[PDB]
Every structure is written in structure tokens, then in C-alpha cells.
Symmetry: D3
């Protein structure tokens, strides 16, 4: 799990560090686009999940899975979102869906310990 929570924070820092003003603004924008608006954050994180799945980025999927849980999304919710990505995106996304499910249970197996 946090093998990618540190692979994130850490590698994210460097990039912004040895970055550019433009790089910084993009990242700020990436994060900004999810903040609550006329749509709550749960919804936007699910859309992030959907877009990440159809575009097949395991790391983005992982990140958004985390946030969704954190935003109180149910597995029923997460999976109803993933079915959309699967159908629009095709069967090539199955290996990603396949790994996204495993990550999700690993996540829930922390909501039972602490």
C-alpha cells in the first residue's frame, strides 16, 4: 500500500522541486479540479476513477481509489463506476479493473484493523 504512498509524496515533491512554474501550476490544477463545487468530492473522485480506468493508469486508479474510500464511497459505488469505464474503455481495461479490485480490498482490510 504505502509503498506507493511514499512513491507518490516523494516522487511528487522532486518533480515540483526540480520543476517549473508551469509544472507547479499544472499539479495545483490537477488537485484543484477535484475540490467540491456543484458536485461533491465523492462524485469527482469517482469521475477521476473512471477517467483513470479508461485511460489505464494503474497509479492514478490507485490514488483515486484511496480518495473515494476516504470520501466514503461504497464498494457498490466504486464498482458501479468501474462498470462504466469497463464498457466504454473495453476489455483491454480488465487487467486494470482486475488489479484495482485487489487494491480496494487491501484498502478495506485496514478499515477492520484501524
Amino acid at each position: 500500500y504505502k509503498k506507493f504512498v511514499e512513491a507518490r509524496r516523494e516522487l511528487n515533491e522532486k518533480v515540483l522541486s526540480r520543476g517549473t512554474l508551469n509544472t507547479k501550476r499544472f499539479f495545483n490544477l490537477d488537485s484543484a479540479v477535484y475540490r467540491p463545487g456543484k458536485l461533491d468530492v465523492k462524485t469527482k473522485e469517482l469521475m477521476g476513477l473512471v477517467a483513470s480506468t479508461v485511460l489505464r493508469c494503474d497509479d492514478c486508479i490507485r490514488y483515486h481509489l484511496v480518495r473515494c474510500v476516504q470520501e466514503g464511497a461504497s464498494d457498490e459505488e466504486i464498482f458501479e463506476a468501474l462498470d462504466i469505464a469497463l464498457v466504454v474503455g473495453g476489455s483491454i481495461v480488465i487487467p486494470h479493473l482486475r488489479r484495482a479490485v485487489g487494491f480496494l480490498e487491501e484498502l478495506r482490510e485496514m478499515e477492520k484493523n484501524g
Copy 2:
């Protein structure tokens, strides 16, 4: 150009299935079923279809989920907040599609204004 759209979809889709296969039909049915009501409401699922269609850059798909979002009563704000997510995730190549999507959405809003139907 809205009437250009809705008509050609019903057209070719019919043709497609016609000379299609039982699989062609099963997939098409599935493309509709996945958007139906569940723990997530229909407006939420239709905006997600808008997000997927935009990052994957498919105009007709974008057009289709646009009317669907309208029907479900999504506010232009709601749509743009979703389109904002597609734009940032899929990059600026998505811009030419976001432009058309707005001209199209404006057309659907005019019709709604003049009480015209859009299904």
C-alpha cells in the same frame, strides 16, 4: 446540428445491429444498461459517461452523453465541473472536443429554453 445527430445514431445503430451479431446486440445493450440507476443516480452515471467520452475524445459519444446529462437535469455547472476533470486528466488534446461540446450544449440549452424536446 442536433437533429443531424440523434437521427444518424438511431439510423446507423439500427443498421449496425441488423447486419450485426447476437454479440453486437449484447454489447450495445450493455452500453445502455451500465448507465441505469443503482447506488449512484442516473445523472451521476451520465456525467461519468461524459468524463470517459471526453478523455477518450469521441465526439458522438460526447454528444450523446450531453443530451443524457441534460435530460437528467445536470446544470451547466455540473457538466463543466466534469468536463474540467476530463480536460485536466486527458490533457489539452481534449480541447478541440471541449469546444464542440460547448457549442452543442448551447444548442440543447436554447431548445430547452424554447420548451423543445430533446431525448
Copy 3:
């Protein structure tokens, strides 16, 4: 429709190669060569291009491989079994490209109806 496409094809074709490079010319040779007969026949070959073209959603490419499959003896029956795979693998986003392929396909099986 058909000619507008082909005449434009070959025209913009030599035009690109025209102002193009040697690296260009070579590549176009490749795209056309890899479909040459081998342990797999030209039809099978061209139906794989059709599948490749559909999942990457390149209408123009699709149209090219589709006309090629017909002239290679493929049937709407076989062509469609190919598109079905393209559909499941590529996803719902390919449907708009499936529509156009069909409309263009019949327009073809409607031309050999006169030769």
C-alpha cells in the same frame, strides 16, 4: 463518397511522400508490405488491419481496410465477426466508428451490385 475517399487517399498520399523524406517513403512501404501474403493470407492480413484500425478509431484507415477485405473476398459475415472483437476490446467509444463502417460497407456491397 468512395472515389472522393480514394482519389484523396492516393493524392494526399504521393503528396505526403512528395514533400516527405526517405524515412517517410520507407515507412509507407512498410505499412503496405506487412499486409503481403505469408503464413497468413492477404485476407486474414487485411482483417487484422481492420481490427487494428477500429480499436484505434481511425475512420480513414478503417475505410481502407474495409474496402480491402471486400476485394479480398471477405463476407459481411466475416468482416462483422472481426468488428465484434474490435468492439469488445476497444469499448463503447468505438461504436460511432462502427456506425460509419457499416454505412460504408453496404455502400460497397451496393457498388459491386453494378461492378
Copy 4:
């Protein structure tokens, strides 16, 4: 790796279906259904799966479709005639995937040479 592939796939597959929905399930079924014999051979159907998964750069999809092409008696020569089509249509960004698919295709060939089960 091959026996790690077929294991996780199978396991995570039943895992996705498990925690999923009738739509998930119906989609997967359709993913296998579209490869069954028709006016076109199953070897041809599977090689097409190989081409599509290659131009789209999906390693798991590639490995899976390789065992199927082998299981359906495709020869390394037939296989490469298909991959060269995916490599050309898909550009050089596919080349890295081509590398892996080769070290995998020969692991299977070596498996079958020692009469080992490839399913």
C-alpha cells in the same frame, strides 16, 4: 512468468466478478464469447485478439491471447506476421511490448516442447 500470470488472472478475475455486478459479469462473458468459431476460424479470431491487444499495449491481454494462439495451433511465423501488423499500425511505442511477448511466446514453446500443459 506464465504460471503466475494464469494464476493471478484467474484469481483476480473471480475476485472482480465476485465483488461486481451482472454488468461486470455480462461484459466478461462477452469478452470470451466474441472469440468463438464463426464464418471465421478461432485461430483467426484469437490472432485478431493478439493484434488488438498489441496496438493497445496491454501486456496481460497480450500474454493471454498468446497462450490462446498457441493453444489453437498458430505457428510462431503466423504469430509474427500478426505482430508486425500491430507494430507497424501501432508505432514504435509498441516495441517494448513486442519484446515481452517474445520472451513469453518462447516460454510457452519450451513448455510445449517438454509436453507441459498450456491452458
Copy 5:
């Protein structure tokens, strides 16, 4: 097709902005900012935009970056050499776009031959 392409993009762009969010403006600005001369001159940046837009197959982004390349003094040699890169990396699926980009390139060299605005 030019005076039609530019006159629509400009209006569509304004339309997208006005009906858009602050996030949309910021993103559109960032998309502009990124091609400004830095350690890399703008001709190179625009050529990279053309290569990224070609392997990604966005016709509009292609026409757009092409004019930019031109108004930046890029020969048809530099432009093709960069296109060859997009071709090999992007695959033969880009060929259709490579065609349209050609017919458009010339249409641009035309307008300038006659000092026509770009």
C-alpha cells in the same frame, strides 16, 4: 478552410471560456504558457507540440501547431523531419492525419507568399 478554422476556434474558445470555470481558464492559460521560449526556443516547443499532437492524432491541435511552427520560421524540412518521428512512434494510424497536415501546410505557405495574415 483556414479563415473558417481560425474564426471558429477563436469564437469557440471564447465560448468555452465564458461558459467555463476558473479551472478551465487556468488550464487554457497553462496550455499557452508552456510553449513560451525558455531554455528551448519557441520553434522547438511548437514542433514538440506538433509531434505530441500528431502521435495523439488531434487534427485541430495539429493544424494549430502547424501555423505556429510556420509563423516561427520552421522550414517544411524541419516540420517533416519532426513528423517522421511522430509517424514511426505513433504508427501508421497517424498517416491519415499526416495527409491533412500536408495539404494544410502548403495552404499556409500560400497565404504568406502573399503576406496574408496568420
Copy 6:
């Protein structure tokens, strides 16, 4: 890797080899220079999200003169055009790059 290309060309075809040629040719100096061409390969490879293609192009850039400054200016273009899904690959690119500066510094060849 470098060896895998052998196994590929080896088990390959006349076309597999002809394609591998173009992919190498296309990047030699011409009206545009090598440094530029390689940064373009970095671009294309970043928007298309191929780590192997990115890494290879990073080495060539690093080994072709290009500085982190020029390399980041190239990456930002990829980030904006390709979008936020490239960020993970941006990460691994940055981490790889400084791994070549925490190496070329101590004088070391780069294939």
C-alpha cells in the same frame, strides 16, 4: 532489454527489422539536430506513456547534451498535452533522470 531486441529481430521478420531501422534512422541529425530529435522522442513517449521508450530517450537526451532545464521544458509540454494521467510516468522520469546525474557525475558510460 538491449538483448531482448535481439530476440525480437532474431525471431522477427524482414519487416520487423525494417521497422526497427526507421525507429533508429528517424532520430539522426538532419535539418533538426539530435538533441532536439531525442527531446521530441521524449515528448511523444511521454504523452503516449511508454516508460521503456521514455527511459531510453532520457539517456539519449542526457547523453546528447540536453540539460535537465531543457528536459523539463520538454516534459511540461508532454504533461499539458497528455494530461494528468502522465504524472505517474513524469515521476519515474524525474527519478530516472537524476539517477543519470548521480552517475554521469562519477564518470560513467551510457549505452
